Amino acid sequence: MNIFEMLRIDEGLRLKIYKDTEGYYTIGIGHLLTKSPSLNAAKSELDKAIGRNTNGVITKDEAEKLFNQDVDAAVRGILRNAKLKPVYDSLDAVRRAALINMVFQMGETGVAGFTNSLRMLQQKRWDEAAVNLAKSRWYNQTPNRAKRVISTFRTGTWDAYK
Ligand SMILES: [Cl-]
Numbered sequence: 001m002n003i004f005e006m007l008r009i010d011e012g013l014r015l016k017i018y019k020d021t022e023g024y025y026t027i028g029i030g031h032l033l034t035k036s037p038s039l040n041a042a043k044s045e046l047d048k049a050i051g052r053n054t055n056g057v058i059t060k061d062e063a064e065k066l067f068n069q070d071v072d073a074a075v076r077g078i079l080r081n082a083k084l085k086p087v088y089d090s091l092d093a094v095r096r097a098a099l100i101n102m103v104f105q106m107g108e109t110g111v112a113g114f115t116n117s118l119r120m121l122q123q124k125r126w127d128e129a130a131v132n133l134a135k136s137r138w139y140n141q142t143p144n145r146a147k148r149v150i151s152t153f154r155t156g157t158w159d160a161y162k
């Protein structure tokens with residue numbers, strides 16, 4: 001398993017504009033288009049991202065292309081972030097993927113916000129970090145996904161995804 005396969009499981013794939021768990025317009029593999037309520041505004045962001053008149057539909061390759069860009073951006077964003085980078089550097093390969101997943105979902109700022117959990121992770125106090133990560137809006141809103149990521153930080157294996 002790897003980051004791409006993990007995220008593809010968490011996000012799924014939809015080739016037509018849809019609303020995310022928060023009611024925001026998205027497409028592909030979790031690619032947010034806009035937080036605006038307007039479907040036009042979403043179509044417009046979509047065509048600009050794809051570079052063609054899409055009419056709200058994209059092909060699989062186009063979705064995969066946004067996905068690759070988005071996983072890259074998340075990695076680079078973690079590495080540029082003063083609060084995230086040291087955590088990322090202290091982790092093993094599996095757990096690094098869990099951190100990337102969270103940033104992909106909630107953005108670098110949102111994640112940087114979990115100050116207490118970040119320190120626990122950096123200290124390698126797995127069980128404690130898992131308990132702390134669970135006291136969050138994140139966990140209460142998308143519990144099954146949150147559980148899978150949490151379990152990954154707890155175990156350092158991909159079992160939650162098996
Ligand atoms: Cl984009």
Ligand SMILES: [Cl-]
Binds near residue numbers: 141142143145146
């Ligand atoms: Cl969920």
